[PDB]
Amino acid sequence: GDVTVILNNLLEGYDNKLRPDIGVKPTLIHTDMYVNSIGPVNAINMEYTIDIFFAQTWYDRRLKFNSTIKVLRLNSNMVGKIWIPDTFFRNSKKADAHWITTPNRMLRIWNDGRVLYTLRLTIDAECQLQLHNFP
Amino acid sequence: QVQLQESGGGLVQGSLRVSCAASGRTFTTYIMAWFRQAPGKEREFLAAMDQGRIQYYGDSVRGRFTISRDYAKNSVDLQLDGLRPEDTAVYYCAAGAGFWGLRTASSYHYWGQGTQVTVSS
Amino acid sequence: NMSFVKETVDKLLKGYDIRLRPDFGGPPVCVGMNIDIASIDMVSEVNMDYTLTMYFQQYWRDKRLAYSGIPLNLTLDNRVADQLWVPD
Amino acid sequence: GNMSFVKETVDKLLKGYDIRLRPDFGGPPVCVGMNIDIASIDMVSEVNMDYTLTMYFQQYWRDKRLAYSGIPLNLTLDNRVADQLWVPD
Amino acid sequence: DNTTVFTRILDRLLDGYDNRLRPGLGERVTEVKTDIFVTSFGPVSDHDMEYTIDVFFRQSWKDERLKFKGPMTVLRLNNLMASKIWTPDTFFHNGKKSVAHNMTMPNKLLRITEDGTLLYTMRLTVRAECPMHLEDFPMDAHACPLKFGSYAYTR
Amino acid sequence: DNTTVFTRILDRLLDGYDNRLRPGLGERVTEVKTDIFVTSFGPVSDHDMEYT
Ligand SMILES: *[C@@H]1O[C@H](CO)[C@@H](O[C@@H]2O[C@H](CO)[C@@H](O[C@@H]3O[C@H](CO[C@H]4O[C@H](CO[C@H]5O[C@H](CO)[C@@H](O)[C@H](O)[C@@H]5O[C@H]5O[C@H](CO)[C@@H](O)[C@H](O)[C@@H]5O)[C@@H](O)[C@H](O[C@H]5O[C@H](CO)[C@@H](O)[C@H](O)[C@@H]5O)[C@@H]4O)[C@@H](O)[C@H](O[C@H]4O[C@H](CO)[C@@H](O)[C@H](O)[C@@H]4O[C@H]4O[C@H](CO)[C@@H](O)[C@H](O)[C@@H]4O[C@H]4O[C@H](CO)[C@@H](O)[C@H](O)[C@@H]4O)[C@@H]3O)[C@H](O)[C@H]2NC(C)=O)[C@H](O)[C@H]1NC(C)=O
Ligand SMILES: *[C@@H]1O[C@H](CO)[C@@H](O[C@@H]2O[C@H](CO)[C@@H](O[C@@H]3O[C@H](CO[C@H]4O[C@H](CO)[C@@H](O)[C@H](O)[C@@H]4O)[C@@H](O)[C@H](O[C@H]4O[C@H](CO)[C@@H](O)[C@H](O)[C@@H]4O[C@H]4O[C@H](CO)[C@@H](O)[C@H](O)[C@@H]4O)[C@@H]3O)[C@H](O)[C@H]2NC(C)=O)[C@H](O)[C@H]1NC(C)=O
Ligand SMILES: *[C@@H]1O[C@H](CO)[C@@H](O[C@@H]2O[C@H](CO)[C@@H](O[C@@H]3O[C@H](CO)[C@@H](O)[C@H](O)[C@@H]3O)[C@H](O)[C@H]2NC(C)=O)[C@H](O)[C@H]1NC(C)=O
Ligand SMILES: [Cl-]
Numbered sequence A: 001g002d003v004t005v006i007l008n009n010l011l012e013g014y015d016n017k018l019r020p021d022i023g024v025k026p027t028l029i030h031t032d033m034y035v036n037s038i039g040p041v042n043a044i045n046m047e048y049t050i051d052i053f054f055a056q057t058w059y060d061r062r063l064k065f066n067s068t069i070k071v072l073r074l075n076s077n078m079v080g081k082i083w084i085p086d087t088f089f090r091n092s093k094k095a096d097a098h099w100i101t102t103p104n105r106m107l108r109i110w111n112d113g114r115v116l117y118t119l120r121l122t123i124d125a126e127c128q129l130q131l132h133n134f135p
Numbered sequence B: 001q002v003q004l005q006e007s008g009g010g011l012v013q014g015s016l017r018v019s020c021a022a023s024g025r026t027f028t029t030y031i032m033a034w035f036r037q038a039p040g041k042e043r044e045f046l047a048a049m050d051q052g053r054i055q056y057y058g059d060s061v062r063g064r065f066t067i068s069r070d071y072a073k074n075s076v077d078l079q080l081d082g083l084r085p086e087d088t089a090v091y092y093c094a095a096g097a098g099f100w101g102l103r104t105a106s107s108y109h110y111w112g113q114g115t116q117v118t119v120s121s
Numbered sequence C: 001n002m003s004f005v006k007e008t009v010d011k012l013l014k015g016y017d018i019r020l021r022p023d024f025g026g027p028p029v030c031v032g033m034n035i036d037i038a039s040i041d042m043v044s045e046v047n048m049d050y051t052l053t054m055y056f057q058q059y060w061r062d063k064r065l066a067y068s069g070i071p072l073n074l075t076l077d078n079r080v081a082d083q084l085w086v087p088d
Numbered sequence D: 001g002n003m004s005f006v007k008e009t010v011d012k013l014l015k016g017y018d019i020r021l022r023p024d025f026g027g028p029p030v031c032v033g034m035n036i037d038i039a040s041i042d043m044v045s046e047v048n049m050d051y052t053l054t055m056y057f058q059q060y061w062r063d064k065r066l067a068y069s070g071i072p073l074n075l076t077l078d079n080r081v082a083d084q085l086w087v088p089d
Numbered sequence E: 001d002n003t004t005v006f007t008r009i010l011d012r013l014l015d016g017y018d019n020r021l022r023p024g025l026g027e028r029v030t031e032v033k034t035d036i037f038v039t040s041f042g043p044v045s046d047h048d049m050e051y052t053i054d055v056f057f058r059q060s061w062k063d064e065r066l067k068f069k070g071p072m073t074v075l076r077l078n079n080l081m082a083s084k085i086w087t088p089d090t091f092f093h094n095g096k097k098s099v100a101h102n103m104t105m106p107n108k109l110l111r112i113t114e115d116g117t118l119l120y121t122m123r124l125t126v127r128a129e130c131p132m133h134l135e136d137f138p139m140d141a142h143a144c145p146l147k148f149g150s151y152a153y154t155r
Numbered sequence F: 001d002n003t004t005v006f007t008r009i010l011d012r013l014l015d016g017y018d019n020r021l022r023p024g025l026g027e028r029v030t031e032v033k034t035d036i037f038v039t040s041f042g043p044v045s046d047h048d049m050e051y052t
Helices: A002-011 C003-013 D003-014 E004-014 F004-014
Strands: A030-042 A047-059 A071-074 A092-097 A105-110 A114-126 B003-007 B015-023 B031-037 B044-049 B055-057 B066-070 B075-081 B089-096 B108-111 B115-119 C032-040 C052-059 D033-041 D053-060 E033-045 E050-062 E074-077 E090-092 E108-113 E117-129 E148-150
Touching: A002 A071, B003 B089, B015 B031, B015 B089, B015 B115, B031 B075, B044 B066, B044 B075, E004 E074
Parallel strands: none
Antiparallel strands: A030 A047, A047 A114, A071 A105, A092 A114, A105 A114, B003 B015, B015 B075, B031 B044, B031 B089, B044 B055, B066 B075, B089 B108, B089 B115, C032 C052, D033 D053, E033 E050, E050 E117, E074 E108, E090 E148, E108 E117
């Protein structure tokens, strides 16, 4: 298959331990977010729940491919195969991805080497409330 | 009022089976034990069985005496094999919570009347 | 270039014994530790415990992982921590 | 049985063992006997409308692929071999 | 090199080793010497009729397959080596829901002596059943058990 | 053995199979016929605005 050989060529010699532009320049990650729902605000624990689709776009010249196909649209299988940013939420008391039925993640690689990586998340983030004027 | 009846033979020349039946209280969650008292000697621990079907035995009677429990009938049985002349004694059924024990008689609150057993060569 | 960095990392990870600590027969390995306390959440009287979130960072020296010709601190993907030795 | 002999026997049994296929994949159904030892029942809850049950659940079946000879004793293997062996779903 | 000899020793020990078979299988009984250090006796929950206990659970046994000659008598190895060898399948009969801590790493240690004596200790939090008789409550006293043994291997 | 033919069939089926690509990629739209059998309609949590 054309897509199969393209993927094998892209992964041939690829090192997911190293970020793109390890010694050249910083990797630029364009971030996008869709808030499905801001869950309840638990004032006792100083936290609120938020459900989001979190998307990150960047460039990896190792994943450039020349072909009539302009974009490879893939499920969560190659998320662990390619390098992924180690984005983490600083003010998260507890966060978890979604795994039903399969991992709620999506990958899309363009011929120019642009990688779009989206995933569903539910985060319990802390929020220090000043309750002087409550309610 | 709680009672612990015992039954079994009195004289052997040898195998035996001494049974003990409880009344007035369900001992499903208690440890049921067998003790022995010879003339002059102090009461000693022969065997015990726990709610988890775990069996504890004294060193003198390990591998010879076998303890079992029927939880439906609320009874504890002791099969005796390889009897010897020094096994002659009064055998006591007991039930308890095993506080500080499983081997000390003081941990058992309920006691049977005792059954004589004698071995003759 | 990235090819030289890839070769250096592969050379470092080749023949690395995760079972042995940095100086298995030698003197003890010195480990520095520092903590950044992100928050303390639930000091519970009934449970007699507290919840503590932190960035816990350990510092040590492993001469097996020394490299030359790359004037950079290589921040590797966190998956390689499974391949490398770390304190228990 | 000697250690090396038992090792070779187990390796022979597990070599070429297709875990994806049930013990008699071709024709007749495989018979599975089951036994339970109830360790405890803990929390019969009206609020949650459920009860908690701890048990030893034992399954018994026959796999002709795993038959061996020359070792009269039964082989109790490490529990990680269950991942290599087929078991009922 | 200092570490290459120990790497060779470990490779030799694991060469042909079958962790599925207990030591002395089919020829002798594996004798496991055990001890417990209770780091903290957890709180008792009367409602659940249970209690918690945090323990260093130490086991030790002889494995003639793992004897070696080397620079040192004892190899204080990483806990990863434990999974590559046979270890007892000890379990708590009256345990309800126990935890084997793995923060930051698996809280285990394995030490192999030159003669083939293995020491293997774990950090555990055991939540065990403690049935109670509450007729004398609150002036009652209990004897909470902690019972453990092999799951698969008989006497 | 009787099951060796099925083992060979499965090995042949998985030989060269790429599970990263949906069936009929670049040739048609993958049609998934779906259905649900509700074995038990769980309780409704009014506090969470939720149901199992
Ligand atoms: C202390 O001890 C703890 C207990 O040991 C320990 O926790 C465990 O840690 C391990 C290691 O970190 C965890 O393992 C990972 O789990 C990830 C998923 O996590 C979610 O799911 C698991 C349950 O996992 C099942 O479900 C997922 C989702 O579908 C599957 O992806 C898994 O394979 C697995 O499926 C089986 O089980 C299902 C039922 O559960 C069955 O339905 C199914 O049929 C399978 O039998 C949950 O446990 C997680 O929750 C917990 O952890 C989170 C995170 O901390 C907490 O927030 C939460 O509260 C829970 O505590 C969570 O829900 C896996 O993705 C991951 O595996 C990928 O990476 C590893 C390498 O890291 C690969 O080896 C592995 O193959 C996976 O990669 C392949 O697949 C991904 C996904 O598609 C690809 O992106 C990737 O490229 C790669 O693809 C290739 O291979 C595939 C086949 O392998 C192939 O299909 C592809 O096509 C391709 O070729 C890994 O398994 C484990 O979950 C933790 N928890 C438990 C309870 O075990 C803890 O870390 C220890 N702590 C410390 C400090 O040491
Ligand atoms: C739902 O229920 C199912 C069924 O009970 C359960 O499945 C079992 O899950 C476990 C955990 O994922 C599986 O265990 C793993 O199995 C693979 C298989 O390896 C063999 O694969 C084939 C043969 O089938 C051959 O290639 C060869 O024989 C392989 O040995 C192992 O590879 C896994 O090993 C790794 O993890 C071990 C535990 O930590 C390590 O001891 C071992 O060294 C391996 O380490 C990995 O990580 C290291 C870094 O941490 C890395 O350095 C190593 O290189 C390596 O990558 C592991 O034993 C088991 O097979 C499943 N059984 C099945 C599918 O039948 C599900 O997990 C369960 N889901 C839940 C609980 O949510
Ligand atoms: C390997 O395991 C099998 C299965 O456990 C062993 O066979 C079984 O041996 C026991 C003990 O002899 C048999 O049970 C006993 O039977 C009598 C008479 O029915 C009964 O009074 C006892 O209470 C007890 O149940 C059991 O029936 C038998 N099982 C079968 C299927 O024949 C076998 O001996 C083991 N081999 C070795 C080497 O240990
Ligand atoms: Cl709210």
